[PDB]
A paper describes a structure:
The Mononegavirales order groups five families of monopartite, negative-strand RNA viruses many of which are highly pathogenic and/or contagious; the Filoviridae (of which Ebola virus is a representative), the Bornaviridae (Borna disease virus), the Nyamiviridae (midway virus), the Rhabdoviridae (rabies, vesicular stomatitis virus (VSV)) and the Paramyxoviridae (measles virus, human metapneumovirus (hMPV)). Besides sequentially methylating the 2′O and N7 atoms of small capped RNAs, CR-VI+ also 2′O methylates uncapped substrates and displays nucleotide triphosphatase (NTPase) activity. Both the CR-VI domain, which assumes a fairly standard MTase fold, and the K-K-G motif of the (mainly helical) +domain are required for the MTase reactions.
Most notably, hMPV and flaviviruses share an unusually long (∼10 residues), flexible β2λ (that is, the loop immediately following the β2-strand), which forms the SAM-binding pocket (SAMP) along with loops β1λ and β4λ, shielding it from the solvent. β1λ residue E1697, conserved in paramyxo- and filoviruses, forms a hydrogen bond with the NH2 group of SAM and is essential for both MTase activities. However, in the absence of SAM, its side chain either moves into the sub-pocket that normally accommodates the NH2 group, or, more markedly, turns towards the solvent in the direction of β2λ, which in this case assumes the ‘open’ position. β4λ forms a side wall of SAMP, and together with αD and β5 also defines a deep, hydrophobic cavity not present in other MTases, termed NSP (or nucleoside-binding pocket).
Residue numbers in the entry: 1617 to 1636, 1642 to 1919, 1939 to 2005
Write the structure that this text describes.
């Protein structure tokens, strides 16, 4: 059942800034190296965007008002955001698109493991070329209605654009489509595009007839970043959110709010992330379990293994704290040779380490 499965997803905290004087800067230098935003994502293996952003939480009223039958997703991932959306709205259907590559993801692996069946996905994107899956290409939009004949009411883009102009290329193409499309023009100018954007400069105008409604700053976003989500529509264009706006809102959420843990614990997922971090790791991860992984080793792979145990060992010895960057900074600055950890382990393994670290801290006391 979709609604029962929603309990494995964590509560989202965000800041909404409607686009419709001197506001001093909020600053706090957190001495953190690890990606602590994955601390409440222990229940998800491949993708985990559903823990970062949600439609019922952010655009809940817009979902109720527009009441779409089909939701369009252009996110280059395993479909965890789409998986959460299926749990929130169990009668909604989906059109899925992701850039076709062997390097990255181009199939809903996470949606399939969360929901079970792909029956609700009416357009998996199968049989499409590399450019017909690329949001920055015309032919991608020309083939979006190949199955779904419903208007693009709410289009959701989680694409991570290499170039900042590539975001614009995608936006201009969305505008061109909604103002041309026989289906979409019948629905009117009350069409939306909710997309991930990296705020870098100030007073940067959006393309012609593209108006920003609100800007959402997520707790789940990388602290050191400037990633936000912007709701866009047809109307007299305004400027994109500036780098300053985001940092202050981002800081408040980091300084004040705590990371909410998931109501339920998917043991299958936790077992999977544990074996993916260190093959042989079993739950619960106690002192006896960690001493077993040490004796098993008695080489680069054996050096990488020891680094992992030593960190998980530090978590066991560390007291239970509130899930906030102040406590994560403490955890980091109390563990000696933190630089050895960052040097030995790659970006994916370091994300896997924090998912398991999070499981531990939640399982404490
Ligand atoms: Zn259309």
């Amino acid at each position: 059942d979709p609604t029962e499965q929603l309990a494995y997803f964590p509560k989202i905290t965000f800041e909404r800034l409607k686009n419709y004087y001197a506001k001093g800067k909020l600053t706090r230098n957190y001495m953190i190296l690890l990606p602590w935003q994955h601390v409440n994502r222990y229940n998800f293996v491949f993708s985990s965007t559903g823990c970062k952003v949600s439609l019922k939480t952010c655009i809940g009223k817009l979902m109720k008002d527009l009441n779409p039958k089909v939701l369009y997703f252009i996110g280059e991932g395993a479909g965890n955001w789409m998986a959460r959306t299926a749990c929130e709205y169990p009668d909604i259907k989906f059109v899925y698109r992701s850039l076709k590559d062997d390097l990255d993801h181009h199939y809903p692996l996470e949606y399939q493991r969360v929901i079970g069946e792909l029956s609700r996905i009416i357009d998996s994107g199968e049989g499409l070329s590399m450019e017909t899956t690329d949001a920055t290409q015309k032919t991608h939009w020309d083939l979006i209605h190949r199955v779904s004949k419903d208007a693009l009411l709410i289009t959701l883009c989680d694409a991570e654009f290499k170039d900042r102009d590539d975001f614009f290329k995608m936006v201009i193409l969305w505008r061109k489509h909604v103002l041309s499309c026989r289906i979409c023009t019948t629905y009117g100018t009350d069409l939306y595009l909710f997309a991930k954007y990296h705020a870098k400069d100030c007073n940067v105008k959006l393309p012609f007839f593209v108006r920003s409604v609100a800007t959402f700053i997520m707790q789940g976003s990388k602290l050191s970043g400037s990633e936000c989500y912007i709701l866009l529509t047809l109307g007299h264009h305004n400027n994109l959110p500036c780098h300053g706006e985001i940092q202050n809102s981002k800081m408040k959420i980091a300084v004040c709010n705590d990371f909410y843990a998931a109501k339920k614990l998917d043991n299958k997922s936790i077992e999977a992330n544990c074996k993916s971090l260190l093959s042989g790791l079993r739950i619960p991860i106690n002192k006896k379990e960690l001493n077993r992984q040490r004796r098993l080793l008695t080489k680069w792979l054996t050096n990488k293994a020891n680094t992992i145990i030593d960190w998980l060992e530090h978590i066991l010895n560390s007291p239970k704290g509130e899930l906030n960057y102040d406590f994560f900074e403490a955890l980091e600055n109390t563990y000696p040779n933190m630089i050895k950890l960052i040097d030995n382990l790659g970006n994916a393994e370091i994300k896997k380490l924090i998912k398991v670290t999070g499981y531990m801290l939640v399982s404490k006391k």
